[PDB]
Structure formats: structure tokens, C-alpha cells
Amino acid sequence: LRAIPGIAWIALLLLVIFYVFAVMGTKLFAQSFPEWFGTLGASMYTLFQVMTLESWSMGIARPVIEAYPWAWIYFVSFILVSSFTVLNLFIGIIIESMQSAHHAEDGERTDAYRDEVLARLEQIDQRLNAL
Amino acid sequence: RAIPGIAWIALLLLVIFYVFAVMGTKLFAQSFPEWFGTLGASMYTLFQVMTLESWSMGIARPVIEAYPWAWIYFVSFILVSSFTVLNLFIGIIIESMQSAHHAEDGERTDAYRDEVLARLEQIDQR
Amino acid sequence: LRAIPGIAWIALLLLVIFYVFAVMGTKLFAQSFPEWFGTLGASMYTLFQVMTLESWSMGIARPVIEAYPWAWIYFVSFILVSSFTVLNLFIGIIIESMQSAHHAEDGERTDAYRDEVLARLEQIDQRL
Amino acid sequence: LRAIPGIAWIALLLLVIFYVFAVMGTKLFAQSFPEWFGTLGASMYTLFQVMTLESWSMGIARPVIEAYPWAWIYFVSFILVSSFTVLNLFIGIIIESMQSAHHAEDGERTDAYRDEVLARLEQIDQRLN
Amino acid sequence: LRAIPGIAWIALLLLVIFYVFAVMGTKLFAQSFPEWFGTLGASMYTLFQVMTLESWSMGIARPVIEAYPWAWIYFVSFILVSSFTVLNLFIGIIIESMQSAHHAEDGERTDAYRDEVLARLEQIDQRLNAL
Amino acid sequence: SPSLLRAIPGIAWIALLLLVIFYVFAVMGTKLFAQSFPEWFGTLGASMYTLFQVMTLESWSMGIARPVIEAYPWAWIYFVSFILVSSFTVLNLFIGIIIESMQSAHHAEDGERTDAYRDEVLARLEQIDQRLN
Amino acid sequence: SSPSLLRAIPGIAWIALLLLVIFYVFAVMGTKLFAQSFPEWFGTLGASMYTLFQVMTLESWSMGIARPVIEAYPWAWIYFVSFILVSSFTVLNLFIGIIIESMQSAHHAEDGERTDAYRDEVLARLEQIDQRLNALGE
Amino acid sequence: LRAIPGIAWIALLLLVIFYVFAVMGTKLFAQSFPEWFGTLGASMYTLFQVMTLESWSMGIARPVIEAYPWAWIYFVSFILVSSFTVLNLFIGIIIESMQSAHHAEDGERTDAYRDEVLARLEQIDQR
Numbered sequence A, E: 001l002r003a004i005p006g007i008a009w010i011a012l013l014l015l016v017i018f019y020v021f022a023v024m025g026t027k028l029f030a031q032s033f034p035e036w037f038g039t040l041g042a043s044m045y046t047l048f049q050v051m052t053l054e055s056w057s058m059g060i061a062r063p064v065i066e067a068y069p070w071a072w073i074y075f076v077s078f079i080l081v082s083s084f085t086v087l088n089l090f091i092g093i094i095i096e097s098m099q100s101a102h103h104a105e106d107g108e109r110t111d112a113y114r115d116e117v118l119a120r121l122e123q124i125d126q127r128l129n130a131l
Numbered sequence B: 001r002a003i004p005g006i007a008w009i010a011l012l013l014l015v016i017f018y019v020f021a022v023m024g025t026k027l028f029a030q031s032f033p034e035w036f037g038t039l040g041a042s043m044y045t046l047f048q049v050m051t052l053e054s055w056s057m058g059i060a061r062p063v064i065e066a067y068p069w070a071w072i073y074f075v076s077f078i079l080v081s082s083f084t085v086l087n088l089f090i091g092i093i094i095e096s097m098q099s100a101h102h103a104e105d106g107e108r109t110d111a112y113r114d115e116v117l118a119r120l121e122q123i124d125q126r
Numbered sequence C: 001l002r003a004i005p006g007i008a009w010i011a012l013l014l015l016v017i018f019y020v021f022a023v024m025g026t027k028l029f030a031q032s033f034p035e036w037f038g039t040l041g042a043s044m045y046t047l048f049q050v051m052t053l054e055s056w057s058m059g060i061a062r063p064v065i066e067a068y069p070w071a072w073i074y075f076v077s078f079i080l081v082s083s084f085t086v087l088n089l090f091i092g093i094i095i096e097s098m099q100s101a102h103h104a105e106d107g108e109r110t111d112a113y114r115d116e117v118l119a120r121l122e123q124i125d126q127r128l
Numbered sequence D: 001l002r003a004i005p006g007i008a009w010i011a012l013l014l015l016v017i018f019y020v021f022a023v024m025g026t027k028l029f030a031q032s033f034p035e036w037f038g039t040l041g042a043s044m045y046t047l048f049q050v051m052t053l054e055s056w057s058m059g060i061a062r063p064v065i066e067a068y069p070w071a072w073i074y075f076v077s078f079i080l081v082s083s084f085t086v087l088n089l090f091i092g093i094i095i096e097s098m099q100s101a102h103h104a105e106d107g108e109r110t111d112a113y114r115d116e117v118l119a120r121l122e123q124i125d126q127r128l129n
Numbered sequence F: 001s002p003s004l005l006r007a008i009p010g011i012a013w014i015a016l017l018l019l020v021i022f023y024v025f026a027v028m029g030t031k032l033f034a035q036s037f038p039e040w041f042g043t044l045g046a047s048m049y050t051l052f053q054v055m056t057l058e059s060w061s062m063g064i065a066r067p068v069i070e071a072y073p074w075a076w077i078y079f080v081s082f083i084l085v086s087s088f089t090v091l092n093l094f095i096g097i098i099i100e101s102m103q104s105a106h107h108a109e110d111g112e113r114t115d116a117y118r119d120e121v122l123a124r125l126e127q128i129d130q131r132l133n
Numbered sequence G: 001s002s003p004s005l006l007r008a009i010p011g012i013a014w015i016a017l018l019l020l021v022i023f024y025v026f027a028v029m030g031t032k033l034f035a036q037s038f039p040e041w042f043g044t045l046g047a048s049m050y051t052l053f054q055v056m057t058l059e060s061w062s063m064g065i066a067r068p069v070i071e072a073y074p075w076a077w078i079y080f081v082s083f084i085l086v087s088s089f090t091v092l093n094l095f096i097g098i099i100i101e102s103m104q105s106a107h108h109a110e111d112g113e114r115t116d117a118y119r120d121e122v123l124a125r126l127e128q129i130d131q132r133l134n135a136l137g138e
Numbered sequence H: 001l002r003a004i005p006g007i008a009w010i011a012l013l014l015l016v017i018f019y020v021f022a023v024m025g026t027k028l029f030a031q032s033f034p035e036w037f038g039t040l041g042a043s044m045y046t047l048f049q050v051m052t053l054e055s056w057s058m059g060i061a062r063p064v065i066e067a068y069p070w071a072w073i074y075f076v077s078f079i080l081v082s083s084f085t086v087l088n089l090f091i092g093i094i095i096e097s098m099q100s101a102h103h104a105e106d107g108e109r110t111d112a113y114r115d116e117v118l119a120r121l122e123q124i125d126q127r
């Protein structure tokens, strides 16, 4: 019933997410956006800032004011990462909790049926009066 | 259901929205007085076109006035209706009958517990 | 023992990820390669070909040999698509079949438990 | 049960970490780090050689660390490859074993319940009186 | 004639060069490179790998460019081992085989000399009968 | 160096430098493990003693190289030196002696056959002689 | 039997390798007593071979660099002599050994030609075997 | 035929041996005593002097042997120098002489055999 260890797996998939999409976003954010005018060792770091840290949400929303017609899916990058994570993580948690519940209750009913085992072998073998 | 997720499928559904909303509302926006400068009214327009009030097929036609360049909307309305119907209805059917199998057969086995105790009482009580 | 709408939305996700890497091929390298300079609407053509077709379009993924350390991700991208989708789909559906197998045989054993019911009855009144 | 898909998709993303840090260690550690002289396609071999073999390619590692301000991220590569190794190996093996254990053990104790069936059939047809 | 044991002789001597120069290398370069830095357990294995494998070994040899004039003699030492040893074994082969060739073939010629013996011993006695 | 003559004392020179090898390596390794070992309670002068011990004779002396297994971390290669020194002795000396023997065999035996041909020259004069007619 | 007829040359590698060693050896023996006295090189940590082959009669000026060994009479004379003795070993071995070995080949071929004079004696054997067989009369 | 300079080759290599053992002595046989008190490059001097000459460098030989286990090796150097020189010098001269011996001896006997040639043709051609 040990189904917890699927936890760190999501965080290392998060490593995958941040690598891929911070690299793409850091190319398109190093190209023209003047907030940093380039991010190689601080791409992870800038996206992680924008993730409701250092009060920097609208902070990133300004360099996309300097390119609005073709740069919005970067704040939507925040959105995408959040959604993908929350989805898989949350649903795994749900399934694990509910397996535990169902097995617990149904097993208790069946061990009452083992009490019925007790009843039976007390009935026949233990009260024969001739052996 | 594979390793996919329900609201994750729905997320890719509004990603489809991004796709074909952006395409359409970017291609012919500068030439039509229906949704003149269609920017955020794309999702609304289409997801409201789907079989709503039996009239939005009617609004799908005035863009059929641009058949060589505006039939992908026929394609796309078919897309959205298709995946909505399929996913929602049929997936919920299978979910419901899975839960049904479990609960139904469990309560039947509780009636079996009834059988057990009835017989054994008839033998033990005397 | 019922998971086929699974296959349905899996095909949907297939088309979605096809579009994803298509447009990624239309933006990251679009100006540098005149191979299909305007991939905006025919990265489909390019990548459909790249689909191990006639052993030459892994070839036509070559304009990634243009920038081999960084863009090798299109070849690796068909790798990823095939792996995740085909792998998970195929195996998981077969596993739903093995679920059905469990149900059938172990239910027959519980009808041997119906034989238990018989045992009950033939203990009750055989020996008043 | 015996699931292949997990380990398969793992192996893919594990190898994507491999090429990422191959690039990480082949562009900044080739033209001036001649331990691996012409490191463009050899980076695969260099990194996986650094992986815990005879305790001597970690010795190849340190003179690369001689460039300390810009030469740290590939034993960072070490820790990321360890990330994926931990995941696949540990989780797969342990959880799978105990799943199968649940199955078999519960079945066999129900067979003990069948010996109780034998008790009832003790006192129908063996003892009439 | 059959001196492949002598090949083993020369081979053992050149491997003596191998061992003793590995020991002298343990002496001069033990702490200087961090390449192995423990040149106490596997000095053999060290120079073993240094010997022309994947070209990564000359790359093993520069971490003791850490000591420029105090480790160059080992670059030329592996020159010594490789070239000297291979050339010695081919020396053995060439020279001693061709010595055997001399003896065999010129002995065949001297067996022709046996035949000339035969002809004149034919001319022993023929002048007693028809003369 | 084709000479077809007796070239054994070169191997003899190698053999006495092999005695020097005994001396050097055995006295190297015999002095730092003279304190911490119970066998001779000081190998200060037991190195050629270990010569006639561990030159692969009696089959128990690599058995006493085992007490060097007792000191594996920085003192392992020394019974490998045992193995070496044994190979030194056997191969070098034995090859020298073998080629010695074959040298002698060839040269002497074929010279004697030539002497036989000279008896034939005296025959050719058997007809340069009495049967002159 | 073909293509060499006593090519026992390649062992000349030995010579060259001795060369290297020799260089090293007595470079060190000049780096030991010197390398702290003279100001010229003033660190012979790796200048050993550089300076030694410079003093190998280069531009008629590195005997010019041998002047600072004239700066010390007894304790500094035998370095140019180092060079002479290196030349002794290497040149003697390679050239003169190869030449004398070829002249040993001359030994062999010369005595073989004498055996062809014994082919002359073959001439005489057939002077009698086939010629005066008394095939006339009597 | 006259491969003579090899002996000088061995002799110069012997000089190299002298240097090597000189520096080993310099390690042990420099300061273990006050008997030479510094030998950082003069073991050559003391060894050429001790080579059983003048009968007094053995008077040198004791105050180094004051440390009995750590000094007899220089006398063993006597032995090393001996072995090297004796073997190679002596037998090299011997071997060269032996080569010349075989050739001279039996080739000259075969010149006599040429006179044999003349005798046998004196019979077979004229009678």
C-alpha cells in the first residue's frame, strides 16, 4: 500500500519543465527585453522570481509591454508551469488517499468474516461429544 | 484512461482554443464587421457558437462567404463539438459504471454476509 | 475493464503535441534555414516527411546538423513523441485486458463459495 | 505488476539530461581543458567516465575545477543524473515488489478459509449417528 | 632456432622498464597532479590508461603539466616503453629468423655438395676393365 | 649481430645484473617492513634469505607472501616483485643455457661431417693411386 | 629468402633513447652544481635541455654562453665535454656499428665466392667422368 | 671482425655506474658520521680513492661502518664495479679473439684444400 514515493518524481519533472521552457524564454527574453537584457545563469532564477516571489509579477509584465504583439505566453509560462504541476500532483494525491480508505474498510469487514471462521470451527470440531 | 488527466485534457482543449482562435482572429480581423477587432472574443464567439440557441450555425455561414479562406471554421467547430461530447459524456459513463461495479457487488456480498449468519445461527442456536 | 475513450483523447493529445513541436520548429529556427523559411503553415509537411520516410527525411532533419548541439531536439522530439504516446497507450490497454482476466477467473472461484452455501444447507437439516 | 512504461519514459528523460550536460561540459571545457582534448562528440564518454569509475575520473574532474569560478556545474551534472537514478531504481523496485506481495498473501489466507470449509464438511457426511 | 622464450625474455625486461618507471613516477608525480593524487594503489593502472587509449590519456598527462619541467620525462618515458618494446620484439623476430634461414638453406646447398661426392665416387674404378 | 659464435656471457652479464636486481629490490622492501612483522623479527638481512625462500620453490613461500597480504594498502606490490624476480631468474638463465647447447650442437656436428668429406678426398686419390693401371 | 639480408638496424632506437637519457642525466649533473650560481639561466628548472642544445654549437654564440662556466675554474669545465661524450656514444654506435656489420656481411659473401672456385673443381670432375671414357678402340 | 669500440661503450656506462653509486653513498655515507661530514657531490672522489688503493681508505671504511646495517653497501659497490668490469671487458676481448680463431684456423686449412684441388686435377686431366 506504499504508494507515496511518486512524490520526488514530480519535482524532478519540474526540473525538466524549468530547464526546457526557461531556456526558450531566456532566448526570447535576452533578445530585447531590458529588465535583464540577457539571462543565462539567471533564467531559472527570473522565472522563479516571477513565480509569486519578490513582488515581481508585473515586474516581468513590463518587458512584455516592450513587446506586446508577440510576447505574452511568458506570463502564460507562469500559468502553464503551475497548471501542469498542480494537475498531475493533485490527482496522484487523490488516488493514493482513496485506495487507502477502500482497503481499510473492506478488510475490516472481511476479518469480521474471519470471526465467523471462529464460530464454525467452534461449532463442529469442539462440541462433538463423541471424540 | 491513460496517464492523462481530466483537467489536463481540458487545459489542452483551451490550448486548442488558443491555436485556432489566434489563427482566425489574426487572419481576417482587418476585413470584417462581425467581431471587428477580434482579440478576446474568439473563445466566446466559438465556444458560444457550438449548437447554442440553434442559430450560431447561422452565424457560421456569413464567414462561409469566404470559403477559400474561412472553411477551417467548419473544421474547427466540428473539432470542439467532437472532443467536448466524446470526453465529457463517454468518460463520465465509464467512471460511473466503474464505481457501480465496486459498490454494487460489495453490497451484494453484504447480503451474502446475511446468508452466512442466518444459516450458522440456525445451526448454533439449537 | 473499459478504457477506450482513453485511446480517443490519446489521439487528441497526439495531434496537440504534433502542433506543439511543429510551431516550435516554426519559431526557434525559422529565419536561419531557407530549407522551409516559411514553416508557418507547412512545418506539417517538413515533419511528416521527417517521420522516418524513405530513410531520407531524418536526412531533411539535417538543417539541424546546421546547429547540432542545440537543435538536435527535433530528431529527439520524434523520439519523445513515439516513446511516450505509443508506449503508454499500447501497454496500458493490454493491462486493462489483464484486469478483465482477473475478474472472470476469481469470480468463478467465488461461485465455488456458492458451493459453500450448499455446505451450509446440507449441515442444517440432514441430522435433526 | 511489471510495468515497462515508467522505466521507458524515465530512460528517455534521463538521456535528455545526458545530452544537456554533455553540452554543458563540452562547450566550456573543450578548447582549454585538454584532458578530453577535442570535446565535441566525446563529451558523452567524458561525463559517463567521470561517473564513479575507478575513483580516477573524479581525478580527471578536479583539474577541470582548477577553473573554479566557471567549473562547478558538471558535478552539478552529477547530482542531476543521481536525481533520475534515484527515482527510477528505488521507486520501481520497491513499490512493485510489495504490490505483488499484497496479491499473493491475501489469496493464500483465503485458502485457509477454505480449510474452514473442510471443517463443515467434517460434520456433515463423516459423522451421521 | 626456437627463441620465442627469448621473446619472453626481452618482454620481461621491457616490462621491468614499465614497472620501475611507474615507481619513479609515483615518486616525482604523486601529489602534483590531482588527476589521481593517490599514485600508490594503481600506478600501473595509471600508465596503463595513459598508453594510447581514446586519446583521453595525453589528457591524463597534462594534469601533471601542473608540473611542467618535472613530468615531461614521463611523456618521453611512455615513448620509451612503447617504441623500445615493440621494436625489440620485432628485432628478435627478424634477426633470429633470418639466421635460421641462413643455416637451413645453405645446408641444403651443402647436400648438393654431397651429390658431387657421389659423382666422383662413381669415378672410383672404371679404368680396370676396358683399358 | 650475426656472428654464429658463442654469445652466452651476455646472458651471464644479464644474470649477474639480475643478482643486482635481487639486491636492490629485496633490500628496498626488506628494511621498511623489518619492524612491523613477526617472521624474522627484522628483515634487515633476510632478503636473499627470502631469495632462496620465495623463488617459487616449496610452494609455501608465496604462502609467506600472505603476511604481505596482511599489509595491502601501501605495501601490496611487493609479492608482485616476488613474482617478477622469480620470472627474471627462470626465463633469463634457462633461455641462455638452451641456446648455449644448440650453438655447440650445430657447429661441432657439421664440422665433423665436413671432415668425412675430406676422407672422400683421399678416396678420389685412391684412384689417383694404386689402381693407376 | 628476400628483402633484408641482415637488416639489424632498427635497434638504433636504443641509441637515440640513450641519447635522451644521457642528455637528461648530465644536464641534471650540470643543473645540480650550477643552476643557482650563474645568473645566465638562473633557474634551470626547465631550462636544462633548452640551454644544453643551445650550447650544441649554435650560431657560434652558445660557447659564448659557455663563458659563464669559465667564470668558475675547477667546479665548471666538463659541460662542453658532456656534449663531446654524448656525441661519442651516439655517433660511434650508430655509424661505425652499421659499417662494421656490413663488412661482416662482406666476410660471408667473400668466402661463398671461394666456394664457387670449388665449382671450378666441378669443371675438373667432368674433365674425367664424361670425356675420356675410352670410347674409341682397343 | 674488429668490433672493438663496444668495450669503450661498456666502460663509459661504467663511469655512469660510478656516478649512481656515488650519489647513493652521498645519501647514506655523507653525514651519518663526522668521517666525511659532507659528500654532496664528492662521493666520486672518496670512491675512486677507496677503490682498495693507498691501503688507508679502509681507515675511511670503518667510521662509516659505525652504523653497521647502513654502511656495508659501499663495499658492495666495490663488488658491483668488479662484476661489471670483469665480465664485460674480459669476455668481450675473448669473444672477438674466438671469432678470429675459427675463421683463421679452418679457412687456412681449406687453402691447403685448394692444394688438394690441384693434386686431383693433376691426376684426372693428364693421364
Ligand SMILES: CCCCCCCCCCCC
Pocket: A073, B022, B023, B026, B027, C023, C040, C041
Ligand atoms: C505565439 C505564436 C503562435 C502564433 C503562430 C502563428 C499563428 C498564425 C498562423 C497563420 C497561418 C496562415
Ligand SMILES: CCCCCCCCCCCC
Pocket: none
Ligand atoms: C483517425 C483514425 C485513426 C485510426 C488509427 C488506428 C490505430 C490502430 C493501432 C493498432 C494497434 C493495435
Ligand SMILES: CCCCCCCCCCCC
Pocket: none
Ligand atoms: C574503460 C575501462 C577499460 C578497461 C580495459 C581493461 C583491459 C582490457 C584488456 C582487453 C584486451 C583485449
Ligand SMILES: CCCCCCCCCCCC
Pocket: D089
Ligand atoms: C534493455 C532493457 C533490459 C532491462 C533493463 C533493466 C534496467 C535496470 C536498471 C538497474 C540500474 C542499477
Ligand SMILES: CCCCCCCC
Pocket: none
Ligand atoms: C524549492 C527547492 C529548491 C531546492 C534547491 C535546488 C538547488 C538546485
